[PDB]
Design a protein around this nucleic acid. Structure first.
Ligand SMILES: [K+]
Ligand SMILES: [K+]
Ligand SMILES: [K+]
Ligand SMILES: [K+]
Ligand SMILES: [K+]
Ligand SMILES: [K+]
Ligand SMILES: [K+]
Ligand SMILES: [K+]
Ligand SMILES: [K+]
Ligand SMILES: [Mg+2]
Ligand SMILES: [Mg+2]
Ligand SMILES: [Mg+2]
Ligand SMILES: [Mg+2]
Ligand SMILES: [Mg+2]
Ligand SMILES: [Mg+2]
Ligand SMILES: [Mg+2]
Ligand SMILES: [Mg+2]
Ligand SMILES: [Mg+2]
Ligand SMILES: [Mg+2]
Ligand SMILES: [Mg+2]
Ligand SMILES: [Mg+2]
Ligand SMILES: [Mg+2]
Ligand SMILES: [Mg+2]
Lengths: 99, 101, 114, 127, 151, 82
RNA sequence: CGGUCCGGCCGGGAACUCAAAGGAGACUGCCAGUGAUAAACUGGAGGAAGGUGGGGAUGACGUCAAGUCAUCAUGGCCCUUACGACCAGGGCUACACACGUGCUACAAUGGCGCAUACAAAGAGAAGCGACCUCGCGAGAGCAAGCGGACCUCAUAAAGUGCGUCGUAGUCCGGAUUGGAGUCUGCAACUCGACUCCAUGAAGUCGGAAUCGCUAGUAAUCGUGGAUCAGAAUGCCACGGUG
């Protein structure tokens, strides 16, 4: 088969050390790996009133960036499966993997 | 924001989850276009008012979780714009830095 | 020339000609001329008399003249004697469909009175 | 071989392949008169190719994405000029004087808070 | 403009003719960013100026433009609450700018059907020194000669 | 308007007119239900409709059918400015 | 390049567009001239960009006993079978008037009809909801796909081509009112949005006065989001023409 792995996080340093962890766990265990590719980063904006009572035109603008990385895996061995299910990832990376 | 106004809100969502999203059957199934369009649909329209004046998610004012403010709400955070800003500058909301594009 | 609507219209195109008939807008006028079989860019000069009471025959299928004015005037007096909320806005001179009267009720109230 | 150029204007992006010899310009598998109805857009895509003289000497295969009419036509002209400077490289210094080498960096200014537009302010009254 | 005295932006020539003064004339005619609408009005007006009333088309356009260009205008000068009207010579950049602005505004307030035929009448009035775009020029020239003492 | 699949009336008003249907003319029926539509079944009754502070009596005639009860009880008092 | 049902749709390619990580680039660095052997100014070359390249964020000591005890917190005062608490209905939408901020107009650089081009930035699971069938229409029925560079919202409008209207209170304007509907919701009377038919006010460019803008700006044309069951001419964003 191919197994597809999506990574999303709020930081880009933390997300591509996490991809570097899973591209090098996967041909250390001996599989061709496809990627990693950066998908477009979805940025969500917010705009608040800062004053407790009036003054409409005084505002702040904030943002959350969600970075995305995609790795496809070519050669899903038995050794490859038990390697990258038991890996030491950080608290900021969300993983959702595809069969 | 007036302890009773929050208790009115806490009671409203707890009583809304009590009936609706479970027994929305009274209008989503019987008030349909087929052979139930006889008296059984009409008794369904009558039966919908036996349930309390609450129960409906259209009476949720959806206030802030800390202060209980009814205005300036943000559904992403659950907090008012005063408390979103006060906690974002403290670094409490993850990934929320000041936007400048 | 004149119709069963016994207004005397223009010598412009017929689809604007029948709009001068009270009770016929543009959709009704397009439905008259399509059922009478006569094109829209055709004036009522070039329209001979066999083509004009085929229009009077077709216009007579709607409630269109001062006979409709009676139907409109019965609609308003009925509310003005029912004593409902719409009749109170009608018998007085204030807007009926729930618009702002603090400002800008000016077409209903006439020019302003200091 | 194909000689290539990339040009862009406001939000448009054009790739340009030039091929040695004839006068066929085809754009998004349509030719110039079918794509650009406006004569001004036809002229500015022609413009780099009359300082360099090309009667029917270069086939141009161009595609373009994004923007509008004048954005795409300026993105083509910037893409042609980069392809011709790849083509012989002696063309640069007269193409500089014509101002065609400059990437036009004029972007739309963002809307600002408190303002009706990028710079339009609401109507002020003293009282 | 206190401190940063600037250059100026360079514009395209007209596509059909290679004219940069017609490109300025289409710009002055243009309303709300509609350039394609305004080129069709000028080209319609320049044709019916050329073909109905003597050829040599943009040769005829400057014959109409020569007859509305002012040579001396007036400008205020504030001293003590009594501010004089002093005649000043007009720059040739401003000469074309004032002539084309007076012709467009003359052609706007006519009663004919199209805009191109209002423009065509105003250019044929100006080529023969009549109309109202010419009379804006001598009204400026009358006022300049009236205040000639303040040179 | 409300759509064609069912006019609205409250049940406490529907039962109260039902017992004035058979048992005859009464005192005017006190109600707070201004949002109910007037049925055929109510011609001849007097419904006292609440308007915020009082109950205004409404004698039902045949042209009131299909209207709301709140239309015959004005909630705002106003008579001239100056 | 092969093949094709002529759609990158298949084989395939990693060039190009683009995506997002890393790096390079602009410093008055270089060349003249002016300058007090100065700091700095004018001009030129090269360059994608030149002198703060464009825009944003970033707001010194302080001023106005400026604003907020109704976001929250808090000193003092006051209420404690009520100034606390629950419920139904009404009200915040009243209307002789005056003012502020907007939207749409008074048309021909336009209105209407048919045909046909070119965007960006977003949102979505009690959600976005395609195809097909029914309805003039708002919508309805059925139901795929999508937690999304994949699916949907979602066919951008100004523009361009052809035809018509021919300077009129009009084929301009769409206020008001009548009738018939749809959807959301326990519930649209007071007091929702939208659709169809009919109605077709004022308005023909605005007194004294006054506002915004120095370039991708003004002007004009559409698109999206937050709030939100439903309910923008407001607010916050985005591109087109210019
Ligand atoms: K009519
Ligand atoms: K206090
Ligand atoms: K109310
Ligand atoms: K009202
Ligand atoms: K407005
Ligand atoms: K105003
Ligand atoms: K309502
Ligand atoms: K009309
Ligand atoms: K909503
Ligand atoms: Mg609500
Ligand atoms: Mg309203
Ligand atoms: Mg814009
Ligand atoms: Mg404002
Ligand atoms: Mg103010
Ligand atoms: Mg590569
Ligand atoms: Mg004070
Ligand atoms: Mg209540
Ligand atoms: Mg209010
Ligand atoms: Mg759709
Ligand atoms: Mg007029
Ligand atoms: Mg400035
Ligand atoms: Mg418009
Ligand atoms: Mg908007």
């Amino acid at each position: 088969q191919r197994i597809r792995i999506r990574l999303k996080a709020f930081d880009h340093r933390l997300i591509d050390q996490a991809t570097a962890e899973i591209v090098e766990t996967a041909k250390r265990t001996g599989a061709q790996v496809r990627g990693p590719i950066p998908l477009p980063t979805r940025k969500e904006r917010f705009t608040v009133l800062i004053s407790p009572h009036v003054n409409k035109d005084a505002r702040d603008q904030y943002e959350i960036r969600t970075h995305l990385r995609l790795v496809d895996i070519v050669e899903p061995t038995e050794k490859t499966v038990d390697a990258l299910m038991r890996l030491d990832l950080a608290a900021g990376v969300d993983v959702q993997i595809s069969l | 924001a007036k302890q009773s106004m929050k208790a009115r809100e806490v009671k409203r969502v707890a009583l809304a989850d009590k009936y609706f999203a479970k027994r929305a059957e009274l209008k989503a199934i019987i008030s349909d276009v087929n052979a139930a369009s006889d008296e059984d649909r009409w008794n369904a329209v009558l039966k919908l008012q036996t349930l309390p004046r609450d129960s409906s998610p259209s009476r949720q004012r959806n206030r802030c979780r800390q202060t209980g403010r009814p205005h300036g709400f943000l559904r992403k955070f659950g907090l008012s714009r005063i408390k979103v800003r006060e906690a974002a500058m403290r670094g409490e909301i993850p990934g929320l830095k000041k936007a400048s594009w | 020339a004149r119709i069963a609507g016994i207004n005397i219209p223009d010598h412009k195109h017929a689809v604007i000609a029948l709009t001068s008939i009270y009770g016929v807008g543009k959709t009704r006028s397009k439905a008259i001329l399509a059922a009478a079989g006569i094109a829209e860019d055709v004036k009522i000069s070039e329209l001979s008399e066999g083509q004009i009471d085929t229009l009077r025959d077709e216009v007579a299928k709607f409630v269109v003249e001062g006979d409709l004015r009676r139907e409109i005037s019965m609609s308003i007096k009925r509310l003005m004697d029912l004593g409902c909320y719409r009749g109170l806005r009608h018998r007085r001179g204030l807007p009926v469909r729930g618009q702002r009267t603090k400002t800008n009720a000016r077409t209903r109230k006439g020019p302003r009175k200091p | 071989n194909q000689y290539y150029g990339t040009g862009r204007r406001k939000s448009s992006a054009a790739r340009v392949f030039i091929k040695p010899g004839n006068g066929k310009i085809v754009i998004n598998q349509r030719s110039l008169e079918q794509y650009f109805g406006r004569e001004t857009a036809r002229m500015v895509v022609r413009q780099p190719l009359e300082l360099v003289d090309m009667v029917e000497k270069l086939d141009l295969y161009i595609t373009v994405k994004g923007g509008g009419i004048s954005g795409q036509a300026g993105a083509i002209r910037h893409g042609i000029t980069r392809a011709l400077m790849e083509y012989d490289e002696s063309l640069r210094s007269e193409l500089r004087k014509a101002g065609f080498v400059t990437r036009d960096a004029r972007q739309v200014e963002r809307k600002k808070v408190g303002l009706r537009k990028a710079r339009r302010r609401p109507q002020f009254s003293k009282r | 403009p206190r401190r940063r005295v600037i250059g100026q932006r360079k514009i395209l020539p007209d596509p059909k003719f290679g004219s940069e003064l017609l490109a300025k004339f289409v710009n002055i005619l243009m309303v709300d960013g509609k350039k394609s609408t305004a080129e069709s009005i000028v080209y319609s007006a320049l044709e019916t100026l050329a073909q109905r009333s003597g050829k040599s088309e943009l040769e005829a356009f400057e014959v109409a433009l020569e007859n509305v260009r002012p040579t001396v205008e007036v400008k205020s000068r504030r001293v003590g609450g009594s501010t004089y009207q002093v005649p000043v010579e007009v720059r040739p950049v401003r000469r074309n700018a004032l002539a084309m602005r007076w012709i467009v505004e003359a052609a706007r307030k006519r009663g004919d059907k199209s805009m191109a035929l209002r423009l065509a009448n105003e250019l044929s009035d100006a080529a023969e020194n009549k109309g109202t775009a010419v009379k804006k020029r001598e009204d400026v020239h009358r006022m300049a000669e009236a205040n000639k003492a303040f040179a | 308007r409300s759509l064609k699949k069912g006019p609205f009336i409250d049940l406490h008003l529907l039962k109260k007119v039902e017992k004035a249907v058979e048992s005859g003319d009464k005192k005017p029926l006190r109600t707070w239900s201004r949002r109910s539509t007037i049925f055929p079944n109510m011609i001849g009754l007097t419904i006292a409709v609440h308007n915020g502070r009082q109950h205004v009596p409404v004698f039902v005639t045949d042209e009131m059918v299909g209207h709301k009860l709140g239309e015959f009880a004005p909630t705002r008092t106003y008579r001239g400015h100056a």
